[PDB]
Amino acid sequence: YPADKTEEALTTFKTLSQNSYQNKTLGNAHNGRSTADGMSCDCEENWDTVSGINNACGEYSECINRLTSIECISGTCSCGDDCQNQRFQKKQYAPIAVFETEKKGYGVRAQADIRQDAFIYEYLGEVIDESTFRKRKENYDNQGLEHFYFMMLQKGEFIDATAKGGLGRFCNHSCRPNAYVDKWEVGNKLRMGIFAKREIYKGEEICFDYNVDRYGANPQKCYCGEDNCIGFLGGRTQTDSANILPVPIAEALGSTNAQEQRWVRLMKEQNKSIKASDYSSINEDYVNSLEMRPIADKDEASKVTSALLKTQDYIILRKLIERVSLTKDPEVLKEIVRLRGYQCVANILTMIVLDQEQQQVDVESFTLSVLDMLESWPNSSRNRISSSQIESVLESVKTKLKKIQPIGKKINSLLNSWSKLEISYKIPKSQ
DNA sequence: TCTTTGTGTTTGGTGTGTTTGGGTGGTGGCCGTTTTCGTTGTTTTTTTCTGTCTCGTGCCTGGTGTCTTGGGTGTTTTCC
Numbered sequence: 001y002p003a004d005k006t007e008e009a010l011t012t013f014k015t016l017s018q019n020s021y022q023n024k025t026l027g028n029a030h031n032g033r034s035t036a037d038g039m040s041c042d043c044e045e046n047w048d049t050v051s052g053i054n055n056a057c058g059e060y061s062e063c064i065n066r067l068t069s070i071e072c073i074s075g076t077c078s079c080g081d082d083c084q085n086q087r088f089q090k091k092q093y094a095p096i097a098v099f100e101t102e103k104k105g106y107g108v109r110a111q112a113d114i115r116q117d118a119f120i121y122e123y124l125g126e127v128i129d130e131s132t133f134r135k136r137k138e139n140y141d142n143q144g145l146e147h148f149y150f151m152m153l154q155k156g157e158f159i160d161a162t163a164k165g166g167l168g169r170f171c172n173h174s175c176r177p178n179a180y181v182d183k184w185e186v187g188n189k190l191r192m193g194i195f196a197k198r199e200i201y202k203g204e205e206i207c208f209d210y211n212v213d214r215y216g217a218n219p220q221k222c223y224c225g226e227d228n229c230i231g232f233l234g235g236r237t238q239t240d241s242a243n244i245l246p247v248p249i250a251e252a253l254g255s256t257n258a259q260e261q262r263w264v265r266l267m268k269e270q271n272k273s274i275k276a277s278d279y280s281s282i283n284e285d286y287v288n289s290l291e292m293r294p295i296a297d298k299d300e301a302s303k304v305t306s307a308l309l310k311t312q313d314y315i316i317l318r319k320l321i322e323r324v325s326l327t328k329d330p331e332v333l334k335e336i337v338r339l340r341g342y343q344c345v346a347n348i349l350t351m352i353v354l355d356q357e358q359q360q361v362d363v364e365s366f367t368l369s370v371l372d373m374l375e376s377w378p379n380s381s382r383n384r385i386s387s388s389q390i391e392s393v394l395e396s397v398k399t400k401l402k403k404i405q406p407i408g409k410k411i412n413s414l415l416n417s418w419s420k421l422e423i424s425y426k427i428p429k430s431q
Numbered sequence: 432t433c434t435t436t437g438t439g440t441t442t443g444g445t446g447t448g449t450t451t452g453g454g455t456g457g458t459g460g461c462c463g464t465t466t467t468c469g470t471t472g473t474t475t476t477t478t479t480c481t482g483t484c485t486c487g488t489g490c491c492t493g494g495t496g497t498c499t500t501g502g503g504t505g506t507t508t509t510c511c
């Protein structure tokens with residue numbers, strides 16, 4: 001496996017055993033209202049005489065304070081000293097190591113198998129106010145740092161892990177994380193712990209959801225590798241009307257922040273229903289009402305290819321194919337060929353005219369609207385097609401819809417045109 | 432295929448209804464003392480109005496999980 005980088009990671013910052021405070025007023029529980037009647041659990045101390053360990057307030061015990069995310073304090077609770085609900089104070093962190101893989105920096109891995117709901121590691125840092133946070137953020141942006149190191153302890157109170165903190169700062173974002181951050185009360189103070197969402201084995205990376213507020217900062221692309229990745233690091237939108245479809249997909253359709261604003265502003269503010277921000281359900285009316293302009297940028301072509309590889313909706317694919325019909329720039333088409341647009345168009349065909357979630361007349365209109373640019377694009381070799389074998393799909397769909405003779409004749413012309421093109425070499429291999 | 436429930440009529444009976452005698456409790460008479468009605472005065476407290484800080488209340492957005500519905504079966508209770 002990857003080489004250990006634990007000491008090298010430790011040397012990059014001032015290691016802390018506990019959270020540091022800018023002042024004694026910050027970080028106090030109940031907004032500084034000292035609960036003199038501290039919540040004392042009614043647990044009886046359970047001392048195992050063999051090991052001398054106080055087993056009270058354990059994981060499978062019925063300690064009320066543990067359920068309510070409050071730690072027992074020695075000398076005040078009936079559970080006695082050294083109970084099993086002093087995890088933050090005793091600093092009983094899980095054993096972890098630091099390593100590096102993929103496009104990520106340093107990352108945290110489990111040195112041992114960790115149970116579900118087990119406390120992993122206490123996020124450490126300096127407790128700071130809002131103005132100090134703004135000053136440090138401006139300084140780091142001037143320094144060009146490309147890493148988040150701020151977490152919101154609570155309203156108006158943040159934790160900075162840049163110069164001083166703990167191993168938890170090296171945990172990387174995952175869109176399907178195995179751990180999560182939670183807020184707990186220890187004495188008259190507030191702590192942020194990290195707990196295991198599931199069973200984690202040795203060697204596996206430990207990750208948590210950042211749910212990051214950008215505060216107007218630019219998006220950063222997410223390289224977590226999870227299948228459910230949204231592609232960028234963020235959280236909830238700063239207001240409604242901000243997105244209706246995912247960016248790459250929205251920009252593939254020619255839509256931008258203004259066009260996504262305009263639809264919601266025209267209907268939602270005038271007593272017509274638009275659901276919350278969720279891309280699992282496509283709103284066909286927005287896609288139909290969207291305006292379409294020809295593509296002349298290769299990054300937009302890459303976004304179109306990503307939308308083809310991602311979106312399953314019939315209407316979004318219809319409007320993307322219509323936009324491609326408007327598009328006539330040869331360089332963008334050559335880029336789409338390099339991106340293997342034929343491969344995506346094969347699946348787009350298959351989902352609509354082999355799988356039947358729609359009506360035959362509308363599918364016929366779709367097929368006539370998608371054969372045209374296939375007929376129009378520049379082609380110079382069958383090796384372009386060989387990366388997709390879309391001809392096979394064309395044969396299957398002309399055979400299925402044999403009653404619709406215009407589609408069959410167009411596919412005849414298309415395969416006749418493609419049959420005459422040249423071929424390119426593949427090195428023979430020993431046998 | 433196959434068990435219950437009602438009102439009605441002849442005859443019995445036991446408990447409701449009626450009738451005399453008396454004794455005890457309700458009815459008539461007058462006298463005294465005080466409980467309460469009436470008035471008058473004080474003054475406590477209850478209402479009604481004005482101004483600021485405060486903290487909670489109202490509303491809106493996102494969503495986790497608790498509430499509701501369909502299927503099987505078996506074991507628990509029902510019937511003779």
Ligand SMILES: Nc1ncnc2c1ncn2[C@@H]1O[C@H](CSCC[C@H](N)C(=O)O)[C@@H](O)[C@H]1O
Nearest residue numbers: 105106146147148169170172173222223224
């Ligand atoms: N899944 C991911 N893909 C890309 N960058 C990631 C990531 N998870 C974390 N990061 C990067 O790491 C930052 C958090 S700090 C994590 C430790 C740091 N990468 C280091 O090795 O020193 C994020 O702001 C981001 O820049």
Ligand SMILES: [Zn+2]
Nearest residue numbers: 041043057063
């Ligand atoms: Zn306890």
Ligand SMILES: [Zn+2]
Nearest residue numbers: 057072079083
């Ligand atoms: Zn305890």
Ligand SMILES: [Zn+2]
Nearest residue numbers: 175222224229
């Ligand atoms: Zn991701």
